[PDB]
Amino acid sequence: AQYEDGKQYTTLEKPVAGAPQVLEFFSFFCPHCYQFEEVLHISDNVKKKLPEGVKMTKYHVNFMGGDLGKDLTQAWAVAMALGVEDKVTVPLFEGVQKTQTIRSASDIRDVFINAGIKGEEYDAAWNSFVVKSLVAQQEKAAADVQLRGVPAMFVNGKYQLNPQGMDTSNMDVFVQQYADTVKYLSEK
Predict the structure, then answer these.
(1) Backbone angles phi, psi at 114, to 5 degrees
(2) Radius of gyration over alpha carbons of the chain, in Å?
(3) Does the N terminus or the C terminus of the chain have fewer Cβ atoms within 10 A?
(4) Is the Cα torsion angle 98, 99, 102, 107 positive or negative in sign?
(5) Inter-residue contact 182 to 153 (CB < 8 Å)
(6) Which residue(s) pair with 5 in the sheet?
(7) Whole-angstrom Cα distance, residue 125 to residue 119?
């Protein structure tokens, strides 16, 4: 066929029931994730080709950057709770990987303060049990799929994108091929 298991994707031998339709994992420590977000805008271009009625989920993982990685998973939980994903994603990436000004929870917090979230509001979210189960969710979802590397995308708990198997000579072509694949997987 044109889309083959082992080529543009792989199939999980143990499928994950009740999984988000389109589930994406990343880490602010992950260099390819930085590319996926800042240069390629993968999440966005995928959304642009998805059907109607399909929900797009993105979770952070712990297994990169030790203590700060875990902190960053709680902060993404806060970001999700407050709905400020789009106002912190870029400064978080650039503070971890570009400028290297993120070294502690407190620096993570500064990014939110600078993005206009109120101190009070952030600290309350950070400590809320609405944030704890959102952290738990992020962990559960990764655990459910044997996650050992990012970036990673899963479709209907059953298919995992394989970007390694797509051409990378042209960035735009890589993205559309990536997105078209998710669409195909989506319809399968």
Answers:
(1) -70, -25
(2) 17
(3) N
(4) negative
(5) yes
(6) 9
(7) 10
Domain residue limits, the chain: 1-188
Structure tokens at 166: 């797509």
Experimental method: X-ray
Breaks (C-N over 2.5 A) in the chain follow: none
> What CATH architecture applies to the domain 1-188?
3-Layer(aba) Sandwich (3.40)
Q: For helices 119-127 and 129-144, what crossing angle results, to 10°? A: 60
Question: Which tokens in the block code for residue 103?
Answer: 């070294």
- Give the chain as a 3 state SS string: CCCCECCCEEECCCCCCCCCCEEEEECCCCHHHHHHHHHCCHHHHHHCCCCCCCCEEEEECCCCCHHHHHHHHHHHHHHHHHCCHHHHHHHHHHHHHHCCCCCCHHHHHHHHHHCCCCHHHHHHHHHCHHHHHHHHHHHHHHHHCCCCCCCEEEECCCEEECHHHCCCCCHHHHHHHHHHHHHHHHHC
Q: Any long-range contacts for 45-49 (C-beta under 8 Å, 24+ apart)?
A: 45/175, 45/176, 45/178, 45/179, 46/22, 46/153, 46/178, 46/179, 46/182, 48/179, 49/179, 49/180, 49/182, 49/183
